[PDB]
Amino acid sequence: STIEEQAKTFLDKFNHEAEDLFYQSSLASWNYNTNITEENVQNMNNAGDKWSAFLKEQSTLAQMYPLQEIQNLTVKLQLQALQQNGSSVLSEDKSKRLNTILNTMSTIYSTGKVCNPDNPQECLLLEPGLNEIMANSLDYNERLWAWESWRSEVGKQLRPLYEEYVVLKNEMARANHYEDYGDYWRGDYEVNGVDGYDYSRGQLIEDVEHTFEEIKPLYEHLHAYVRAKLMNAYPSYISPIGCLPAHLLGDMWGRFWTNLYSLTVPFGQKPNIDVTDAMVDQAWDAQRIFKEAEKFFVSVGLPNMTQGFWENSMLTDPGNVQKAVCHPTAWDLGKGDFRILMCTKVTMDDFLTAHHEMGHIQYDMAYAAQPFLLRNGANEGFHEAVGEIMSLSAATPKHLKSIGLLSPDFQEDNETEINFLLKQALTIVGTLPFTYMLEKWRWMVFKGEIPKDQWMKKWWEMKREIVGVVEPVPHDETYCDPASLFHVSNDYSFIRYYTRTLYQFQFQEALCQAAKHEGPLHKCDISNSTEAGQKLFNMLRLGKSEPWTLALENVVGAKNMNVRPLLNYFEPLFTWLKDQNKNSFVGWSTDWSPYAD
């Protein structure tokens, strides 16, 4: 018939061959990421390059097809996803150099060891060690050793590689008819030509700026509280009113403040709801954590997990004999198999991460019936949002008492709510400003507003004015501190997590309203609420077949990301936290630092 039916047949044979090729390439990537060797680097690289070449030739074959013939909007979405000139636009030599840079950075981050001379010989890894050191130690010099070591012995390696990566990705994106590579990352969030549902990328950065500006008060108050507590626990190292050093955040870079809970518990005379001790005293392992996640998903109405998931998942650390990337991940490999890469420890952070990854897997399992090009979540934000909906619904004291892991006689009082909310605020409201600042730096450095050396200066300055976190030792232009993070050195997008927080809070509000939970939202548990699970199932089975705004309004009834549910979560918190800092200076001066005197 006409070219429309020809395009339909094109899509059919594409989806078949692409299913096969994607399964093979995903297998190669998985075997690289769990069994890191050189043979696996070669296998992953050649499989990925072959798949990319096939995708680019199919993309040209689709570029033969004007989109003006489209009646079915789903078909338009599929061809538009196929209409890319793609990252393969670059020259083969240039593409190989870029891939070399990316791989070199990936291995330097995931395997490069710390050998610092401040403790004159000290060599360790990122996994238990540096992370555990920054998470469990309450002494200044040890934290300074860890921080300065990771920054001056690993960032200096990645400074030239990140420079080359920035240049190559920026020019490739300009070849792809984009302003920069941050433009590619933002244009991932595009919605085009759907009856008034359209969404640009400049509107996305404007929305992120607006939401951050609205958030800022709460994070400022939480900052002031945690700084007062640290100065109480660190006598002569946190100077009175200003910021505090970067190694004092219970995390390597200062992304999560949940560990500071141990130091910043508001009411310690109550039973601990951050139950790591309860888990270890209950003889808990990774498998039981994952199985309780499966039980939660069954009880919310979603079907039980696949046997192949149990058989083929890397549910624990493979060991120190092989250096597998231990940053938790969730994988589709196609054809009906699903995997989780979790180096699971017995800790609330790992329990919540396991729930997050199981939500990822359920999201992946629901839309598997869709065609290949739409076999992906409506956004990265939606995947992570589903995962942390599950995580938030788990953490309620009522749920903890449901499995009997929390004592059945445990009493729910005001101080328990304050403890719960302070922990949740530490986590979420410590990620938010850090992610916003980090991707602001990445966006504006890709766009080219910063001279190359000035990179470093600019970076630190913005932290001092956005995250309220400073350095104790000078770092000139020869360092590369941003690359010290996983996502920065693995070509990831970090605003994904900001959208994650906002989306998960809107979804939790709407889903608890659907579940008819009676009471405040922050104790709502959507377990045993099969109809709520059915609604969520509809949303995350929709897939990418419709614009993400449509699924947004399908669940909550909004056309955009909103900050209202998040502030409705931490309202009793905000009250208590304001009540405590009534006699404290909430805020930090930009030119004010224990180092930058």
Author numbering: 1 to 597
The authors write:
Here we introduce ESI-cryoPrep, a specimen preparation method based on electrospray ionization in native mass spectrometry, designed to alleviate issues associated with protein denaturation or preferred orientation induced by macromolecule adsorption at interfaces. Subsequently, we assessed the efficacy of the ESI-cryoPrep method for high-resolution cryo-EM analysis using five model macromolecules: 70S ribosome, 20S proteasome, apo-ferritin, human angiotensin-converting enzyme 2 (ACE2) and streptavidin encompassing a wide range of molecular weights and biochemical properties. Our findings demonstrate that ESI-cryoPrep effectively confines macromolecules within the middle of the thin layer of amorphous ice, facilitating the preparation of blotting-free vitreous samples.
We acquired cryo-EM micrographs of the specimens and performed image processing for the five types of macromolecule, resulting in 3D reconstructions of the 70S ribosome, 20S proteasome, apo-ferritin, ACE2 and streptavidin at resolutions of 2.7, 2.0, 2.1, 3.3 and 1.9 Å, respectively (top). The estimated B factors of the five specimens were determined as 50, 62, 68, 100 and 52 Å2, respectively. The cryo-EM 3D density maps exhibited sufficient quality for unambiguous atomic modeling (bottom). Notably, in the regions of the highest resolution, fine features such as holes in tyrosine benzene rings and extended signals of side chains of arginine, isoleucine, valine and serine were clearly resolved. The angular orientation heatmaps of the five macromolecule types (70S ribosome with C1 symmetry, 20S proteasome with D7 symmetry, apo-ferritin with O symmetry, ACE2 with C1 symmetry and streptavidin with D2 symmetry) demonstrated that ESI-cryoPrep specimens notably enhanced angular projection coverage and increased sampling rates of Fourier components across most viewing directions. The zx slice of tomograms for the four types of macromolecule prepared by ESI-cryoPrep revealed that particles distributed slightly closer to the graphene side but not attached to the AWI. In ESI-cryoPrep data, the positive z heights of the 70S ribosome, 20S proteasome and ACE2 correspond to the AWIs, while the positive z heights of the apo-ferritin and streptavidin correspond to the GWIs. The same analysis was applied to the ESI-cryoPrep specimens, where the KDE fits of the datasets were characterized by relatively symmetric (Gaussian-like) peaks, with only a small fraction of extreme values (blue).
